[PDB]
């Protein structure tokens, strides 16, 4: 039974402009575990996207945490984009520092 990924995008540390931080995209509740996760700035892949190990919760739902080094600005968009066979096409969530 196919289940859709839920996505949160959010920063490791309280965001200040021009100050090294880590951007997270935490994707949960998908099945089967096969999945693709891109992180984006102004629509381009951010280079060094570390991916965590395919894990799952005690209720069998998978989760994964993608992250990458970044310096937050006010002037660029930041996003996370997920491709999964539950969805006919990719889903994207934009970073919002207030969330």
């Amino acid at each position: 039974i196919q289940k859709t990924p839920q996505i949160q995008v959010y920063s490791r540390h309280p965001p200040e402009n021009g100050k090294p931080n880590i951007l997270n995209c935490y994707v949960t509740q998908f099945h089967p575990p096969h999945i693709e996760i891109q992180m984006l700035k102004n629509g381009k892949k951010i280079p060094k996207v570390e991916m965590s190990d395919m894990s799952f919760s005690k209720d069998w739902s998978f989760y994964i945490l993608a992250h990458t080094e970044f310096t937050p600005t006010e002037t660029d968009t930041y996003a996370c984009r997920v491709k999964h066979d539950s969805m006919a096409e990719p889903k994207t969530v934009y970073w919002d520092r207030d969330m």
């Binding site: 039974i1 839920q6 949160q8 490791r12 089967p32 575990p33 096969h34 395919m54 799952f56 207030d98």
Partner: protein
């Protein structure tokens, strides 16, 4: 306090390639400490926490052998299950196993776990008595009868009561100042003006460990449950967690509402509001 060791194992079929992808992740107290991934160029259990780094090559080779055997076991079981469910050829299929032990605050075995999901759905679980099996469906009944015959529960019980406890003890000592320590939430409130005469009190808990936490919003004294927005507790990436809880509030009534944070690391529950 109490502690736990969990290994989470996943084998996934995909249309096309001979052998499915097998992954195992180990957690001590819901903090990642070892990992094996059959896709990696040199498949082996690897340390995922600095304190585990001081296990020697014999440790790593013996655990790796367990992973390699598990890979074989999942490969065969994947196929066995294809037949049990009269699934044809191909499709994408998944098999999950969770196992491990909970200790009390006295470090003694509280509960053992050995359980499997097929296609994300309960298949078979070792009962708490560590002797009998609960089988979710008729297919699983076949497996049950099989494992009753082979006495597999005895094997599992021996690991759960023995090896699992004994090594969790070793890990708790070895990584003393990480696992047996807590990190309490740094809490604060951000303010977000909204539609007509409505702001939005968001209340933040940051940098806590473990992940269990609770946030409430109160007005005059009556806990608010409806109208309120929660996010799922999330990893920050550095061993800690975040959560927030928000609510609708009119302009002027900020000093009426209060957020409470409940976490193990706190000497007591936490109260706070907007600070201009």
């Amino acid at each position: 306090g109490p502690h736990s060791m969990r290994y989470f194992e996943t084998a996934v079929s995909r249309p096309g390639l001979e052998e499915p992808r097998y992954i195992s992740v180990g957690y001590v107290d819901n903090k990642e400490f070892v990992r094996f991934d059959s896709d990696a160029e040199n498949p082996r259990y690897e340390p995922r926490a600095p304190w585990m780094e001081q296990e020697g090559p014999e440790y790593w080779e013996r655990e790796t052998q367990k992973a390699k055997g598990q890979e074989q076991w999942f490969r065969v079981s994947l196929r066995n299950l294809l037949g049990y469910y009269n699934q044809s050829a191909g499709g994408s299929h998944t098999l999950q196993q969770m196992s491990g032990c909970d200790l009390g605050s006295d470090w003694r075995l509280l509960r053992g776990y050995l359980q499997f999901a097929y296609e994300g759905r309960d298949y078979i679980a070792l009962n708490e008595d560590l002797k009998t099996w609960t089988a979710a469906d008729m297919a699983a009944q076949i497996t049950r009868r099989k494992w009753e015959q082979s006495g597999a529960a005895e094997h599992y019980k021996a690991y759960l009561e023995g090896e699992c406890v004994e090594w969790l003890h070793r890990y708790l000592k070895n990584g003393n100042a990480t696992l047996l320590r807590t990190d309490s939430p740094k809490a604060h409130v951000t303010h977000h003006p909204r539609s007509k005469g409505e702001v939005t009190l968001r209340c933040w808990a940051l940098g806590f460990y473990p992940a269990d936490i609770t946030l409430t919003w109160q007005l005059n004294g009556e806990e608010l449950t409806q109208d309120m927005e929660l996010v799922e507790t999330r990893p920050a990436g550095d061993g800690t967690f975040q959560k927030w809880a928000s609510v609708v509030v009119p302009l002027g009534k900020e000093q009426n509402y209060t957020c409470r944070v409940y976490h193990e690391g706190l000497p007591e529950p936490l109260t706070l509001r907007w600070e201009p």
